[PDB]
Amino acid sequence: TGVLTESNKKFLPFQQFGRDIADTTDAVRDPQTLEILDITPCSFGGVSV
Amino acid sequence: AYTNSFTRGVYYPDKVFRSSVLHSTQDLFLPFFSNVTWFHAIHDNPVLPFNDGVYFASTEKSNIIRGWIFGTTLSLLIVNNATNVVIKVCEFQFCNDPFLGVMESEFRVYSSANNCTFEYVSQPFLFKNLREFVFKNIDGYFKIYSKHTPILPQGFSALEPLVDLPIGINITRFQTLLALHGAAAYYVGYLQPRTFLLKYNENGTITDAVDCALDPLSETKCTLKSFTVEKGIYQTSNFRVQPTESIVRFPNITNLCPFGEVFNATRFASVYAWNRKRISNCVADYSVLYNSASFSTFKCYGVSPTKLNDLCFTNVYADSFVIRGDEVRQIAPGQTGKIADYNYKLPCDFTGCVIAWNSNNLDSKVGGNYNYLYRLFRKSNLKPFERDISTEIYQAGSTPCNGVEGFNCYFPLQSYGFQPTNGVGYQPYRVVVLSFELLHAPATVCGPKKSTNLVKNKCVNFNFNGLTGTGVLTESNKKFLPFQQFGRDIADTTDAVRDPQTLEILDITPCSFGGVSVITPGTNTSNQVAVLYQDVNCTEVNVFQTRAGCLIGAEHVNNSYECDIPIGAGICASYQTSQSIIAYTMSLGAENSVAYSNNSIAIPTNFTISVTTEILPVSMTKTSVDCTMYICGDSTECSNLLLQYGSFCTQLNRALTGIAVEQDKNTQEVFAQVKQIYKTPPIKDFGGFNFSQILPDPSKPSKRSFIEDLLFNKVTFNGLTVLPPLLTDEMIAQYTSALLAGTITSGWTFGAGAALQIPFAMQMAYRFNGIGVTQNVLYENQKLIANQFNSAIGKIQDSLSSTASALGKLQDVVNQNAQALNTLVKQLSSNFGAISSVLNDILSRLDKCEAEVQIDRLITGRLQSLQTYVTQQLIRAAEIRASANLAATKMSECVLGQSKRVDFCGKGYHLMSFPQSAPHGVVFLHVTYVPAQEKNFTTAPAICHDGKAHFPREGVFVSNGTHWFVTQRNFYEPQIITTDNTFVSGNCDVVIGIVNNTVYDP
Amino acid sequence: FNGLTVLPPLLTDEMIAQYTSALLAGTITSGWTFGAGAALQIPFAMQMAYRFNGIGVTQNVLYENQKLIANQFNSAIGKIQDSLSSTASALGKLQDVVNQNAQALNTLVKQLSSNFGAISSVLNDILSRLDKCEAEVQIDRLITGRLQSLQTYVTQQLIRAAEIRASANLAATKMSECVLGQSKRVDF
Amino acid sequence: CSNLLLQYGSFCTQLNRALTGIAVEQDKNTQEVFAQVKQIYKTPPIKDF
Amino acid sequence: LGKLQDVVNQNAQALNTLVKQLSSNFGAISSVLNDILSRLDKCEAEVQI
């Protein structure tokens, strides 16, 4: 679950999905069309009164 | 021939994009700096066995190589003819001369193809260029990686993947095919299991690697997960002596255990009185029973039957009986039913196993066999392993029938009617249960495996009557009593054992282990290292033995210096001069012996103004983490499973919130000591002193001083968040500027009440008075003092514009927090024994009832990681609060006043202090008075003038050899001895050391 | 010897003795001057007069009673010897520390003798009795509990180390203020 | 057993790190207490105090 | 007097939490021991316990 964005990462033609230093699935290549999409978690955060 | 692999043959191990990451992998690889075999074969073919994978690099110009062959004995026949790829899997016939054409005029790869299994043809395609290749296979996959680059040359080159066409055969043997009509060069490497550390750049390409099981420096890099290691000692691994061989030592008995008589018996007792045969003091063969197919079920609790032949049991109990057919599974631990509670109860902790076989032949007879009886009613359940033999009728009601059969008074024993006519669900079954009990005693029953001779003074794998262990055996001196068998330690460790065969006592000790640490200078300096094998004699591994262990790679030096790297026990190592690593005993400092005498004093005639820096952490980052996003990322059923653990998460959040509030409190109590924001005047007539480097300058948008700017440039989404500090850095800068303005323009008066102006030189005179120096000393040297101060300030700038390590106290704090957080995130990638570390995968693969088991296993461990993190943060926050309280005390005492406490506000007599803000901390510039060039003088405690004794009011009586003066203690300012700077007390016959001299009187 | 080891301190006891002897020599022969800069010699009785001045007593009082004072000092020192050659409880503050650490370690070892619900506390017995698939269940049950014992031990050690650091900072402050100088702080 | 331990993550690395920090802290404590003096002073042979 | 009051509150808070954790199943069938012991026989009861 997350928000998908057009990326600028230079995936090598064999690479499929990227990962973060935190071992998080940062980016994914779409199977159908060969483009790279950055995944980011859609915004969360505490609410204080 | 041979040559060297200068860091060649590293590939992308997987199709994952990683950018600017230092990632550690562990798989088949070519070790760095290895013997890669050079071939220049002319024009059957060479045979180069597939051990685990092959590296192949050729600066091709002709490619007379024509084919790859894999198999066990020789069947994979792969051929790249430089235009297409042809794979065959057929049991080919290898020819007398295995080769093919260079075009093709031969068919000598094989004569025919029969019972073919696979075939494939790929697409058609067509010393300057080096072509590197890697061929391996993993569990069916046959992977080829490649790299084709223009130019073994040194440097670096990553290998991209290529076609994987899995087959999955047993490959023990490899050939590269030759051909028959010049020669070229091709190098053959050999992969092996290996751990690497790969450095991806911002484009995602590997640019460098570390073969970290190569040499100690690389191990250090791999433990630190960095390509650069600073000077120091790093504990990198654990050395331990491997056992050389295995020792099996069992008693000398050979009488086989009587198993036939409790299996082939014509009679088995009825279940209500199961018959218990004992087995002890014999050799039991459990393979014959398990391998026999005569048994319907053979199922074992606490043991695996296939290993039963390798165990030693103190006692065995074979309890035999017969039961009805599909009651067979009532004979099991923790089972309920009619016979499992009334007739035969096993313990929950039942070690041993159950054997059942159908017997519809000798236990069944036409007309019914009524000898096989079982109790059906009892007043209570049966305890584990108790037999109840009785015939009293069951008083189902309250009637004391006392042995008469009627209503509510039933006979408890009911008999099966066993016939061959009965079906499978009724027909009798013969059952025997073997109850062992395991090692708490000298074993009696042991398997059929044979003993062996023992060895001593060598680490081995010993096995004494099933007592397994690893260690070194030694002849002992312990006085075992003749019934005692094995000793034990205060730590409940098996210290000693008596050999079953020969009656002697052997001490067991664990063969030596211990950490191994890497002494290195900074890799920026050099790459030589030493290694310290801790607490181990190095007859077990120049070489130098010391109290900490054995140090190799470092030479011993008799000359003592100050420490550079602590080994331990008085030993430090350093990189010195050719250059090498030396190890030495620490010199505690320059030997000194001050020339004490009972009438000699030493007084300074000058001084220095020294500015030192003390850097103190004050706060740390206000992080906050919520469970139900960290533990259970937006999974509602995971949250439901979390709710039943209680209020762990509420209290974790509360603890972290308390820490976060505490940080703001720390900053408040340190910096917000001043009530009003004071401002320095536009004029800077501070008596020649120069504060331009510490006062704010309006030239910058941020109103930080020069030194604050230097300091700020010297230190650098899973439910985690970082709350901003309440006080922004500009507010901290304003507080520090206010403190500086108050200190400069008002002195210490602004800390007690309203800020009272005073010229700077006057508060300076005050402060010199405060250290026992008369104020004239300042006014007569004011310019000099100012210059010294300014110079000191300048040096501080230099010492902060060159060396970044001075701020380390702050940097470490930051690093520590970051370290913890990184760990907290990586624990989200751990299974904790579950099937996966990803919650959604578990939820998509499984249904609810087993999914929740795995999810519970994950929660138990993610929660634990959180608790660990929060506990560490609480302790670190207590440490930071201590440091902040110290900083507040220093601000109150060193800045807002003048402290007489020694070495509290710097080394020397404290004059003053300046605060400077730093990221998550504070820097005090302690200005101190340090005495300088001194002279010996003759002295005397008192002076006799007219019989009466004269003592100095403040100061000491000194003499330059002829005349006696009185001088202040911390600065040579002799004055004529007079009845005003001295006072009189008594006569001159009691003071020990008094001297004769006149005393002037106006 | 279950993976535990005790690293030697960097400073050997002889080096500590050398440091203390150096501090004593500086205090005796130079006063507090060696803590501020170069050690400036001064006769002992003169720094004694200085220190009496430091408590609001004029220095004549010393020179007119010097012998007496010396005797008292010596007598006090003698009594200290006696009070340290008879009663061992005076050192208890140190002894307790040692005991505590040892106590923890003993506990850490005895937790290796606990099943934690497994069939045995010995790993090799589990591995020899069972096949892999149930053996790993028991081994996981053991690891979960040995790891917990380690975490408990390390947390206790961290807290105790914070306490010891507080005491050491106090000791450093006392060395700086009481030895290297003369403190006006009361009962410090 | 070590393979079964590997799947609990980096608990053990951080435990070792914590104990190492304690051990270094002890030497630091001793340094800051006793190594306040810079030179090793020696008392004179005479004891006329 | 809040500095003192907070201390008291904190301790009380902890104790209250310590008691409420006696009402948690921790994945068992019940948070009450006697209910587990009355509903089940020994061999599965000890698992829940």
Ligand SMILES: C=CC1=C(C)/C(=C/c2[nH]c(/C=C3N=C(/C=C4\NC(=O)C(C)=C4C=C)C(C)=C\3CCC(=O)O)c(CCC(=O)O)c2C)NC1=O
């Ligand atoms: C042997 C198996 C074999 C492999 C694995 C292989 C892979 C391979 N070789 C390539 C280029 C190429 N490959 C070759 C020939 C060779 N390169 C070699 O490693 C060898 C052994 C030869 C044959 C002697 C040439 C001439 C090019 C084009 C080079 C150019 O641009 O001029 C390419 C790039 C194709 C493209 O343009 O997209 C691939 C994928 N070619 C092969 O023949």
Ligand SMILES: *[C@@H]1O[C@H](CO)[C@@H](O[C@@H]2O[C@H](CO)[C@@H](O)[C@H](O)[C@H]2NC(C)=O)[C@H](O)[C@H]1NC(C)=O
């Ligand atoms: C006290 O020390 C200062 C420096 O520490 C002396 O000042 C220096 O004097 C020399 C003359 O020999 C000059 O060349 C330097 O430029 C001076 N330095 C500064 C910073 O002014 C001073 O002379 C000394 N006083 C006595 C009485 O010896």
Ligand SMILES: *[C@@H]1O[C@H](CO)[C@@H](O[C@@H]2O[C@H](CO)[C@@H](O)[C@H](O)[C@H]2NC(C)=O)[C@H](O)[C@H]1NC(C)=O
């Ligand atoms: C206070 O000291 C600073 C140096 O840190 C002086 O600034 C220098 O001033 C001279 C001329 O006076 C310039 O040539 C330099 O370029 C300045 N340096 C910097 C870094 O700014 C400043 O002048 C001094 N103040 C007084 C009143 O003399």
Ligand SMILES: *[C@@H]1O[C@H](CO)[C@@H](O[C@@H]2O[C@H](CO)[C@@H](O)[C@H](O)[C@H]2NC(C)=O)[C@H](O)[C@H]1NC(C)=O
């Ligand atoms: C000790 O100090 C006295 C006091 O100044 C010195 O006596 C003076 O010496 C100078 C030159 O020697 C004469 O110009 C003065 O007239 C002397 N003053 C008096 C009052 O006699 C004496 O020389 C110094 N001695 C030593 C060894 O330094």
Ligand SMILES: *[C@@H]1O[C@H](CO)[C@@H](O)[C@H](O)[C@H]1NC(C)=O
């Ligand atoms: C079929 O696959 C091709 C491959 O690129 C893709 O472009 C196309 O959109 C796909 N069509 C459908 C209907 O999935």
Ligand SMILES: *[C@@H]1O[C@H](CO)[C@@H](O)[C@H](O)[C@H]1NC(C)=O
């Ligand atoms: C090849 O290996 C042997 C032993 O492993 C070694 O002695 C030899 O130096 C190696 N060859 C080269 C060229 O380094």
Ligand SMILES: *[C@@H]1O[C@H](CO)[C@@H](O)[C@H](O)[C@H]1NC(C)=O
């Ligand atoms: C690789 O990194 C460099 C770094 O400046 C960049 O200029 C370039 O666009 C990146 N991509 C390629 C294909 O070189």
Ligand SMILES: *[C@@H]1O[C@H](CO)[C@@H](O)[C@H](O)[C@H]1NC(C)=O
């Ligand atoms: C048989 O047992 C005796 C008992 O002491 C022992 O001395 C002897 O070595 C044993 N022999 C064999 C072959 O095990």
Ligand SMILES: *[C@@H]1O[C@H](CO)[C@@H](O)[C@H](O)[C@H]1NC(C)=O
């Ligand atoms: C007697 O028992 C042994 C071992 O249980 C078995 O191998 C053998 O077959 C039995 N005898 C018969 C006649 O089945």
Ligand SMILES: *[C@@H]1O[C@H](CO)[C@@H](O)[C@H](O)[C@H]1NC(C)=O
């Ligand atoms: C190391 O081994 C030697 C071998 O004789 C022995 O003498 C020595 O005591 C052992 N222990 C050390 C050097 O600490």
Ligand SMILES: *[C@@H]1O[C@H](CO)[C@@H](O)[C@H](O)[C@H]1NC(C)=O
């Ligand atoms: C160092 O001192 C030892 C004394 O045991 C002596 O044997 C050795 O030769 C000395 N080495 C040097 C380089 O002076």
Ligand SMILES: *[C@@H]1O[C@H](CO)[C@@H](O)[C@H](O)[C@H]1NC(C)=O
């Ligand atoms: C004081 O006298 C002693 C012994 O004569 C000498 O070693 C020392 O250097 C003298 N002091 C100075 C400052 O020269």
Ligand SMILES: *[C@@H]1O[C@H](CO)[C@@H](O)[C@H](O)[C@H]1NC(C)=O
């Ligand atoms: C100590 O002082 C006395 C007289 O004050 C003197 O006789 C003696 O020589 C001095 N001590 C030394 C070591 O010179």
Ligand SMILES: *[C@@H]1O[C@H](CO)[C@@H](O)[C@H](O)[C@H]1NC(C)=O
């Ligand atoms: C000091 O002078 C008195 C009388 O003037 C004399 O008795 C005494 O011996 C003298 N002492 C010294 C040390 O010169």
